[PDB]
Amino acid sequence: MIEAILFDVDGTLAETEELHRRAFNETFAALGVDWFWDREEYRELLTTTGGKERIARFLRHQKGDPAPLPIADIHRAKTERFVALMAEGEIALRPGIADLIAEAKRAGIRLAVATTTSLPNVEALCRACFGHPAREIFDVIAAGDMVAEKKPSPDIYRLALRELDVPPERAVALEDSLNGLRAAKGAGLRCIVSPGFYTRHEEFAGADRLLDSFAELGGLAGLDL
Ligand SMILES: [Cl-]
Ligand SMILES: [Mg+2]
């Protein structure tokens, strides 16, 4: 009875944020700056979605070295590093995600990504974790700077839904974070949340289901109601 499923990427398809943190810190070292993001600081910075936006936020207050390149160039270098780290093959899909996507495809349900991450990151994740280019898994990919305002703005979900051509009442989102939940709900979507390391402390008021694992969905019927 669902016609589309819209997936968040980071923390939803896979636990990626520690790898992102590594890519940031390695990039900073390679750039010769003293910046270093520990887990405590990264958990705070994660409330700003988008890598460029997160760098900009850090730069507004930090007292270490000035940026030696434009943010966009720092971000490009960090993206390249993340893509390379992803290809090492150590990241797995979260439990339940592969089974849901296979069931959805058997049922003819269309699939989207709706993410704040840059597009090359989606592609790298799909190559490593699904063994296909992203466009063979997802019918619609809404990512990165495709919209002006990132999650918690619903705009990326509104884009995905327009491209899917499915009304929100007939779709559902899977998310891991409060910013993501808010974005989905603003787009009129029911939203299933399963948190992870960096989001477990958050409160998820209005999530339609709150699960310890996507393996607890119980199939496509678990998306209904
Ligand atoms: Cl990013
Ligand atoms: Mg996420």
Q: Which residues contact 174 (CB under 8 A, 6 or more apart)?
A: 5, 6, 7, 8, 12, 191, 192, 193, 194, 214
Give CA–CA dist 116/52, Å, rounded. Answer: 10
Cα(88) to ligand 2 centroid in Å equals: 22
Residue 155 vs residues 48, 87, 152, 182: alpha-carbon distances, Å: 15, 30, 9, 11
In terms of DSSP bridges, do strands 110-114 and 4-7 run parallel, antiparallel, or are they unpaired? parallel
Give CA–CA dist 65/63, Å, rounded. Answer: 7
Delimiting residues of CATH 3.40.50.1000 domain(s) in the chain: 1-14+92-225
Closest CA to 87 of 141, 23, 139: 23
For the CA of 178, the nearest ligand = 2
Q: Tell me the resolution in Å.
A: 1.2
In terms of DSSP bridges, do strands 140-142 and 4-7 run parallel, antiparallel, or are they unpaired? unpaired
What CATH fold (topology level) applies to the domain 1-14+92-225?
Answer: Rossmann fold (3.40.50)
Give CA–CA dist 199/9, Å, rounded. Answer: 14
Give CA–CA dist 40/198, Å, rounded. Answer: 10
Count of C-beta atoms within a 10 Å radius of residue 130: 18
Delimiting residues of CATH 1.10.150.240 domain(s) in the chain: 15-91
What CATH fold (topology level) applies to the domain 15-91?
Answer: DNA polymerase; domain 1 (1.10.150)
Catalytic residues: 8, 10
User: Which residues keep their CB under 5 angstroms from ion ligand 2?
Assistant: 8, 10-11, 176-177, 180
CA 117 from centroid of its chain's CA atoms: 6
Q: What is the DSSP string of 13-75?
A: TB--HHHHHHHHHHHHHHTT------HHHHHHHTTS-SHHHHHHHHHHH--SPPPSS-HHHHH
Q: Answer positive or negative: Cα dihedral of 139, 77, 178, 150.
A: negative
User: Would the annotation count 120 as a binding residue?
Assistant: yes
CB 14 within 8 A of CB 6: no
